[PDB]
Design an enzyme around this catalytic site. Structure first.
Site: not given
Ligand SMILES: [Zn+2]
Ligand SMILES: O=C(O)CCCC[C@@H]1CCSS1
Ligand SMILES: [Zn+2]
Lengths: 336, 336
Positions: A107-108, A265-267
C-alpha cells in the site's frame, strides 16, 4: 476468459493485467484488503473463496512492520521491509489452498518511506532471479505530495526497474504540480509510464478524502485519455479508488463504470475484525482464568473459553462478512 | 561457546543438537511455545530476543490448521499441512530479525494424524533438495497409544527418512508395550533410534498427565541409559517435558537436572495472550464505530482505538511477558 480466473494463489506478470482487463470488461472491481497478520489474511482469503471471487491483500508501511512486530526497530524501515517480506512468503504459501487468484500488493509508500520500497524491490529482484516471479505482485508509490514532474519522474525510475520483473506499479497522483486532479495531470502520468510497461494503475484525486465525491471526474480522465491515445478504448487507464468508505452504491457504480478495478478498504475491516472479538465481552465472566459464574463458580477450566483459536476466529468471521458485503457491492462476488 | 548461541534465525541440523547439549551442559531448559498466527509467533520471538534466550516455536496439528484458517476443511489433514507449511515459511522469514536461534518444531502427531506428518515430511524433503535444509527444525511423533513394540518401529522408519536431512525427531512413549514408563523401555527407544542418528529426544510418562508427577524418574532414565551403554556423560538422553503446568520450581529443576532440554508451554501463553486484549474491555466506551464516550458525542472517530495494531499488540505484550517469566523459571533467560 483469461487464465487468471482459473488459477489459485498469488499471481504475477501478465496474469495481473488480465485479471484487471476482465475487471473492466465484466464491469466490477476487486477489494484491496490491508492485512496485518496471518489471521487477517485468512479472513479475506476465505471471504473471497466463499463468494468465489478474486482478492487483493495489501501491506501498508505500518501494516508491514506489524507483520514483523511493533517491537522491531523501524527507524530504518527495517521492520516494514522484513515483515512485508514475511507476509509475502506466508501469503504465497497459504493462498493456493483457498483456490482463488490473489494479488499481493503493498500500500501507500510516500517519498520519506522509499527505503521500505527499496528493500522490497531488492527482495523482488532476488526472488525474480531464482523463481521467475518477483516476491510481491504489485507495489504502490504515493508521491502525490510532491510536484507532479518529480512524482512521475521517480515513478518512471522505479517503474523501469519493476518492468524487468513484469511487476505491477500503482501510482497515486493528487493536486500538487507547483481542487481535483485534472484529466491532464492523469494523462501525463500515462504517457510517462506507458512507454515503460502497461502494468500500471493510477489512483487520482477526485474528492476521495484520506468538497465531496465527484467520481465522474474519473470518467473524464478516461475520455481525455481515449481522445489523446486515439483508440476506441472505453477504459484506456487502470483506475484505483482510495478512501472507499461510506461511498454509496451510486458512487461505487459510476466509479467501476469509469474503469476502477481496485477499491481499497482497510478501516472498515479494522472494525469488522474487532466486533467479533469485542463480542467476547459477552463472556465477560468466563474469561479470567478459573472463575466461571456458570457451573463451577471458581473451579472451572476456562481453557475452552480463552483459547485464541475460539475468540480470534470470531474476528476472522466478522471481517470476512464485511468483505463479502463489499465483494457483493463491488460486483466481484461469483466472478470466477 | 557453540556457534549456535551466536546464530539468528531458524536453526537446523546439529546446531539443534548443539543447542541441546549446551542446554544440558549449563543446566537450563528452553520453553517450547505453541503458536497459531503471525501475531503469536511475534510474541515469543520478542520474549526471547529481549531476555537473550533461545526459543522453540511449535505448531500443534490444531495450531497448524489454524495457520491455514479454521474454514479450510481438514478432513484428509489438508488444513494442518498448509498451515504448518505457511507458518514454516513465515517463522523462517521473520525469525532472523529477532536475532536468536529458533528451533521450528511440531507438536502432537498421533497415529490418526500421520497424513499431516506425511505432508509435512513430504515438503521437508522437497525443500531440502532445493535449499540444503528442511522446512521445520524438528517434528514429533506421539504414538504412545500404540504398543511400544509398534511405536519404536514407526519412529525408526520416519527417523531414517529424516536423518538424511538431519532433522530432529522427538517421540512420546507411554505405558503400554504389547504406573510410569520404565527406564528400560525408554532405553529401548535410544537403542534403536541411535543407529539412525543422534537427533532425537524422548517424552516419557512420569505423571505429567495431559498417580502424580515424578521428575526423578527422568534421572532414572539417564542412570539406566549410561550403564547399558557405559558412557561417562551424565545425560545420554534428550528429555522433553510435556504438560509441565503449575509445577513447582523444585519440580522443573529436578527435571532439568536430569537432562530435560525443552519444556512445552501453550495454555498459559493462551491465557496470557488473551488478558491483554481482554483488558481492552476497559476501552469499550471507545469501541463502537463512531460514538465515543470521551470527546464530542457521536462525532469522534474511534479509529485509533479499534486499529487491531494497538489492541492485538496488547495481547502480544501480555503473552510475551508470560514467556519472560517462563524463561526465568527454566533458566534459559540470558543464556545467549
Ligand atoms: Zn491514497
Ligand atoms: O511458566 C512456567 O514456568 C510454567 C508454566 C506451566 C504451564 C505450562 C504453560 C501452559 S502449557 S504448561
Ligand atoms: Zn505428550
Amino acid at each position: 476468459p483469461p487464465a487468471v480466473l482459473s488459477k489459485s494463489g498469488v499471481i504475477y506478470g501478465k496474469d495481473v493485467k488480465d485479471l484487471f482487463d476482465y475487471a473492466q470488461e465484466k464491469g466490477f472491481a476487486i477489494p484491496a484488503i490491508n492485512v496485518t497478520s496471518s489471521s487477517t489474511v485468512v479472513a479475506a482469503l476465505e471471504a473471497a473463496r466463499d463468494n468465489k471471487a478474486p482478492i487483493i491483500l495489501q501491506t501498508s508501511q505500518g501494516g508491514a512492520a506489524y507483520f514483523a512486530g511493533k517491537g522491531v526497530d523501524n527507524k530504518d524501515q527495517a521492520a516494514s521491509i522484513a515483515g512485508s517480506i514475511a507476509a509475502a512468503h506466508y501469503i504465497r504459501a497459504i493462498a493456493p489452498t483457498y483456490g482463488i487468484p490473489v494479488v499481493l500488493h503493498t500500500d501507500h509508500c510516500a517519498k520519506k518511506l522509499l527505503p521500505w520500497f527499496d528493500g522490497m524491490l531488492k527482495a523482488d529482484e532476488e526472488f525474480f532471479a531464482k523463481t521467475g516471479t518477483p516476491l510481491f505482485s504489485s507495489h504502490m508509490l504515493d508521491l502525490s505530495e510532491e510536484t507532479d514532474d518529480e512524482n512521475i519522474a521517480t515513478c518512471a525510475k522505479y517503474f523501469e526497474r519493476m518492468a524487468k520483473m513484469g511487476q505491477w506499479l500503482e501510482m497515486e497522483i493528487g493536486i500538487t504540480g507547483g481542487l481535483y486532479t485534472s484529466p491532464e495531470t492523469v494523462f501525463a502520468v500515462y504517457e510517462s509510464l506507458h512507454k515503460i510497461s502497461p502494468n500500471f494503475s493510477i489512483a487520482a484525486a477526485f474528492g476521495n478524502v484520506h468538497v465531496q465525491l465527484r467520481p465522474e471526474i474519473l470518467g473524464d480522465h478516461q475520455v481525455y485519455a481515449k481522445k489523446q491515445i486515439g483508440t476506441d478504448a472505453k477504459h484506456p487507464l487502470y483506475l484505483v479508488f482510495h478512501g472507499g468508505s461510506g461511498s454509496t452504491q451510486e458512487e461505487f457504480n459510476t466509479a467501476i463504470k469509469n474503469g476502477v478495478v481496485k477499491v481499497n478498504l482497510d478501516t472498515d475491516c479494522q472494525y469488522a475484525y474487532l466486533t467479533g472479538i469485542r463480542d467476547y465481552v459477552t463472556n465477560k465472566i468466563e474469561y479470567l482464568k478459573a472463575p466461571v459464574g456458570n457451573p463451577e463458580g471458581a473451579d472451572k477450566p476456562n481453557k475452552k473459553y480463552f483459547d485464541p483459536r475460539v475468540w480470534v476466529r470470531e474476528g476472522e468471521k466478522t471481517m470476512s462478512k464485511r468483505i463479502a458485503e463489499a465483494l457483493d457491492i463491488f460486483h466481484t462476488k461469483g466472478q470466477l
